[PDB]
Write a protein that binds this ligand. Sequence first.
Ligand SMILES: Cc1cc2c(cc1C)N(C[C@H](O)[C@H](O)[C@H](O)COP(=O)(O)OP(=O)(O)OC[C@H]1O[C@@H](n3cnc4c(N)ncnc43)[C@H](O)[C@@H]1O)c1[nH]c(=O)[nH]c(=O)c1N2
Ligand code: NA
Length: 516
Amino acid sequence: APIETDVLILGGGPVGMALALDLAHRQVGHLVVEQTDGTITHPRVGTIGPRSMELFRRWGVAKQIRTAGWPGDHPLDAAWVTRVGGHEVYRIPLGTADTRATPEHTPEPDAICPQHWLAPLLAEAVGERLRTRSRLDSFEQRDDHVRATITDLRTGATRAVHARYLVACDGASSPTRKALGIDAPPRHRTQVFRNILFRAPELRSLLGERAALFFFLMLSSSLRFPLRALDGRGLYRLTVGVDDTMDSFELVRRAVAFDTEIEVLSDSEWHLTHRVADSFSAGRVFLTGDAAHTLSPSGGFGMNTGIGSAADLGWKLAATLRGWAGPGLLATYEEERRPVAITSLEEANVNLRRTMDRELPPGLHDDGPRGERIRAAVAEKLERSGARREFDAPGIHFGHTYRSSIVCGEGGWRPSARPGARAPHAWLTPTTSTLDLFGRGFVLLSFGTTDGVEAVTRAFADRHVPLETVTCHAPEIHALYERAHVLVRPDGHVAWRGDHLPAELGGLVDKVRGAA
Ligand SMILES: Cc1cc2c(cc1C)N(C[C@H](O)[C@H](O)[C@H](O)COP(=O)(O)OP(=O)(O)OC[C@H]1O[C@@H](n3cnc4c(N)ncnc43)[C@H](O)[C@@H]1O)c1[nH]c(=O)[nH]c(=O)c1N2
Ligand code: NA
């Protein structure tokens, strides 16, 4: 018989899963179908965003990700070398998990957690709602729901799923997207690389102090990319460029000066694409993650961008499914994220270019200081190239200010409380971040007077819009937020702020919930 759920999530990837996690906290009926059995062959994601960690903090799986296995003492450095274990050109020291100065504008510093340890962790949090070895064969929208056919690759049986909404997180090649006939045109030249995943039990030990998280190699046209430590325990990945031939083990050898054990596990080829979808949805069917926006892996914004996009669609679907959301709300999913996707895409392309552009002087490898200062050349050249930005982008992670139909709009990135932005972090208790008050429904922070808040309470009450009022008394945070009254949304972003509440409250409410 037909399995009927509120939200059918097509795809078990990080984004599709993040969505499930959010929906879970919002008590939304959902089910996730993943064709593969659920395990990672070639781990792609390695770095989890500070903002993605704040969300996981809410969804209660952050502690886990942090302690999933990345060596607390493993360096987080990014070094530029002629050959891993050869002539070092430049290095950005970034301490270690257990050693770096705690963040400040956030309670969750970025974490390292290779996808194969991540996938499991999430699978657990999602629990029973995840259907592995289940493939979506087709779907068809009805007047008020979507019907899909899923094959149980495992028992051979094919059942139907009747969901009220279909969120497609099927990845970059997103068949769903093609089906709906939505195009995701290239915004930058599509490139090709080969990712070689290999084990090397003695490499970190041979490296010693020289150990590092990323090794950007400066050896050739195809071998001028990073070789990164996936689990800081022997697993590495040397990404190499292509031009229409070499041997896997050969390439790794080319890259590693040491003559140590080297076991090649994979040599999967991939395409670097910079493409966002013309539209983010079509009726009761939506796109999320790479399916909606896939950009360059440089600086690792991909999943994180989708996780945010995940969180956005998250509450909005819940609002609609509950009935308090205005009919225009779901539409604002594209209105707000598509732009983010694009600014994130570009910032990535920037990182990419910083490498594609950087040239390699012919006398870079040559030993002996008679052609060694040739390195001190490109050395500062990089310093100047502003390359550390590829590892420090609070702007891309915490920045993004929505400027849309449901927002009462007003150098380096800094925390703001201005409408459309992510309410900034600040400790209410050495154990409680302002960030922790948000996530469920709407929230109204009042730093001074509690005058007129009752009116606001009633206002929301009428339209059945969930609202919570917290009366804060910290002058320090009052300053951070600036205005006396700040209305944060379920997604954690400010929708309105002012020293005086509006007169036509009803109007307000109907605006922020996509009713106006
Ligand atoms: C080399 C490299 C390195 C990185 C990255 C990319 C690359 C190429 N990224 C980008 C990141 O991997 C990407 O943004 C996410 O994987 C996207 O996740 P999704 O869940 O959206 O889809 P994803 O592409 O992961 O998964 C799609 C899922 O849908 C399933 N599926 C598809 N069609 C189906 C069907 N018809 N029926 C059933 N199941 C179906 C698939 O089997 C799969 O599980 C990254 N990002 C980041 O944040 N940090 C990082 O460190 C990196 N590093
Ligand atoms: Na880092």
